[model samples]
Target: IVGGYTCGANTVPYQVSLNSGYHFCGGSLINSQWVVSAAHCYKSGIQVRLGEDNINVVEGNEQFISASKSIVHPSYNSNTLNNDIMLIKLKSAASLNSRVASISLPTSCASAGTQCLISGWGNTKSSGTSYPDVLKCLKAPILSDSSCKSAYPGQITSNMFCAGYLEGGKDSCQGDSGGPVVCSGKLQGIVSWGSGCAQKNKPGVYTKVCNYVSWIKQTIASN
Candidate 1:
């Protein structure tokens, strides 16, 4: 994540590395057998790693599992990044313990100005080149949809929201997609897309999780 510090091991136990044979994207454990991530993070040979802090070095707390199925939102629009959320069904249930657990879904929409926390192993720079071996985290304030639309005209939609510093120095960048944006101790957003990492006036856009609670619940039920 952009402009963040390394998070302690098991600090964000629900956070996962969506590995396509290697670390490529981030995700969150929504349940013992389900993971919530960005639909665009989908790729072949994808595996999920829970309770992982570093990708270069294997740790004792990590659990590696293959994906049984990937369910991308039916209405997902790659061009505009609308409905960018997805769910992964694990081949087997994850063994839960103190270092691995699920994140709670938001009961309501996150209001503007809500301070949210985001964690991932994305690029530390805007060039999308350098990556951190350790999980990084930062706090960003949610902005009103109107404010987000002003920065990303004709792009930001109801299915998405924004969070970050207007003056720059904090945001989710490439490779951080599908990671959770937690607010008030609940999953509120999923890192979707953005203009760039930590750019002035360009806040990071995210898939609004609260808006699709019904869809998420139904998908889990039928699958």
Candidate 2:
């Protein structure tokens, strides 16, 4: 963040494939015209593909839209990877359908010990070179900040949270940055960083979506 399974078609309709030359990161559709992702994924001329199942094959329902604007959190720290969340304003609004929809943001922080699902087209293995043509998903329990702090002392900040297995395996790997971490049908976190792909005692760290609710609402209103 390594192990995940291929997801079914329309399993996560809000999931977006952010492409820069090629598929680079995953994101979530929060509104008809806005996408929420990691600030670290910011790039010029990025395009987004919605309602996509198998990225290798273009589908009629897929909506391809170029980004009109990208707003990265001004306090984002690449060195520490803090405040890693960002938003993309689509040039055209997405059409809602059976295979294209927006996800709801969490009203509160995710509670520890609840199972959450994370999906992406990230690497299948730590040493493998290929990424999945279809989306992959893994369910992992949310770990408490205390538990996470024990594993990564002085590294887990309030702006971040942790999720994954203690024994290792089943996580979001490379190319999964900015992907959604859905808990109870709500967007809770964004894939931000990790120590290595599916390593023991080193669960993946994510941007705490709940921590930025005010900022998100303010930004959307102004922009």
Candidate 3:
């Protein structure tokens, strides 16, 4: 997370790290057993660490468990990067607390220019290795679909959205995919893709959560 600040203790209760001996992607616990993440981050036997502020420390409040099933969006097109969302189920239900809880799915779509949070343990730099041990967070406003298309040109789709500055100072990077973008106190976006970490006219792109609300609810309701 470039140009962001360290996340305070329990600042993001729903946030979780997908770990396989080490943090790989950031996810959100939407319920006791279910988590929302990027479709591309799928990996069975991966650990889900809840209540984690610093990935390197024990952080007693954390709830650690392995992933059981990861259901990706049926229409997710990897080549074009459309519908890059997924639902991951934990092996066991998480014990919720002040530091561990669920985040609600969005009730409405966020308009352009809406400031939403983008938090994770991704690299701090566009190049070179620099994943922060502590959770990092930054707020970037939602960019219009038109503006987003201007950056990628026919690459941006309805399933995706862009947030961050065109001038490029703050954005999510590698290892941050599947993290949360909280807007209006609800889960609005999931870190998915971008041109780079953060660059001029190349803002961070995300999975538009509002478009998948029904799919998310239906997926949970049926299976």
Candidate 4:
């Protein structure tokens, strides 16, 4: 996250790092066995690490768990970046504790202008690669669907929402994809894509989580 603050320990218990030797994307744990992230971040050999704050240091509280399987939403369109959500089932259930817990999935969509939180280990600047060692977060207001469409002009779909300041200086950047965008203490969005980090008139885009609540519930129950 650009122009963000470091996340304190246990501040984001549900936040997770998708690793294949390094942190590539962020995720939110919805249950002991399942995590939701952006489908664009999917790749084989991804490891889900829970209870992590700083990626560089060895945190004893961290639990390195293997992904049992990944299910990208059937409607996901990589070209248009629509329906960008994905669910990863862990090889074994996470051991929930003070440092590791699950976040509630949204039952409904977040209203416009909601102060949502976006956290990740993504780039700290727009023009360079600088993934932070400690998790960083910032607050961005959710833009209305109509406003989102206006900014991108026909690129915004119902499955996508926009957040961040139009004048720039803060946003979810590259490597932040698949991270949580929490609103009202629920997982309301997932970092999907964006034009440029903290760019004016180009806010960060996210997967609207509520749109897939039915799919998420049914998939967990039957998968």
Candidate 5:
């Protein structure tokens, strides 16, 4: 989530906004009319700015989409950070433009060793507070379900993904619980939690988006 280092760059090809001043992690465009992010990120009067940089708005492609509805997964449990995904229905469709490209959802779950990108404007370090205005990014590979199981035992789950840093000092931290983890230009996961910021023997955990695709589609369709 925060202060992690990626092998390449961010997968934030689309811009994600919040209320005029509310902070947000990264988000992904789904079906051109909806966006998928974390339920923990829910805030009032949300506005999602698409196709823009951290500061500047994309000309022509720029949009000020109002969230007519916010749908958090029904089974979501804030206490355990389980089923943390959510969808936002924009009032209107976002037209296709150079800067307004929507990322494809993961057609298949990635196997172990697939590298992924994650980004957020969060703490520069694990113990520090969040960054007020800068979005940072990092990269890590998906750990095999068995690998995570061996490492953290019962901490692993079917709906979760683990990304680790062998050398430590690089990982997602607090205030970064809802960012996106991408690979192969597709969204693979959403940041959820970790043992601790950059902790050894502990990798960051995320909600596996691939496993929740059907739920996402159903929710958006119902919305």
Candidate 6:
């Protein structure tokens, strides 16, 4: 879990350009020096901007930071979206101020179907449309574990959590992976996947932040 912020950026904030300008679907500051994002984000180069919107050309009092190293769980498998999490260890921590801060992971985040905030600069209109000029956010509820497991069957593993609208609209879209799902003012999950954004009987899946705290603490410590 990490802090959620209201950064004004293109729909695909934190996008990497060299690799097809492959975009970062989501990201957040875990500490002054590190950031957590989806594993899929690292396939492209690590490029970051602060205090502005749009990635193709930096604007709005922005500063850039290079990544020192990236640590995506070794066991990550894109095919199944397993371990679909990663951390970007910045070459130097982003300079923080009023608009920048870190978010702590929640300790007891098991409440299901409860309200939470989903923040992203994702498609404000279509499935993968990138928002290059502004950030967008939506409020969604977590899906009960039973409901999620039932809808997804055995494919929904213990390490994953589910949230999103069950209807055909109002869900995390294609460019929204790796964003924050905040609960009780703390970080709870990282957006992972879904059959499609807001598909009926299909909610967006995410990495269970609380369940993986031990691993996170260990990794942060060793690094």
Off by over 4 Å in 6: 1-22, 54-61, 126-132
Q: State which candidate has the highest lDDT.
A: 4
Candidate achieving higher TM-score, 2 or 6: 2
Candidate 3 similarity to native, TM-score: 0.97
Question: What lDDT does candidate 6 reach at residue 199?
Answer: 61
Off by over 4 Å in 2: none
Would you list the C-alpha lDDT of every candidate in the order shown? 0.91, 0.89, 0.90, 0.92, 0.71, 0.66
Cα error, candidate 5, residue 195 (Å) = 3.3
TM-score of each: 0.97, 0.97, 0.97, 0.98, 0.84, 0.83
Give each model's clash number. 0, 1, 0, 0, 4, 9
Error of 1 at 165 (Å): 0.5
Q: Over the stretch 38-140, how does candidate 2's per-residue lDDT look in tens digits? A: 9999999999999987888976668999999999998999899889999999999999987889999889998899899999988878666677788889998
Tens-digit lDDT string for candidate 1 (124-199): 8965568889999998889988899999999989989989988888889988999999999999999999888998
TM-score of candidate 1 against the unseen true structure: 0.97
lDDT of 6 by residue, 64-154 (tens): 6767778897778888887888877767776665555567777786588678777765555434444543455667788888988988887
Residue 134 in model 4: lDDT? 86
- Candidate 6: C-alpha lDDT: 0.66
- Comparing candidate 2 with candidate 3, which one achieves the higher lDDT? 3
- A best-first ranking of the candidates according to their TM-score comes to 4, 1, 3, 2, 5, 6
Clashing pairs in 2: 1-197
Flag clash pairs in model 4.
none
Worst 10 residues of 6 by lDDT: 11-20
- Model 4, range 1-223, lDDT digits (tens) per residue? 9999987876999999999999999999999999999999989998999999888798788999999999999988889998999999999999999789999988778999999999999999977878788889998899888878888997998889999888889999998999999998999999999888898889999999999999999999998
Error of 5 at 126 (Å): 2.5
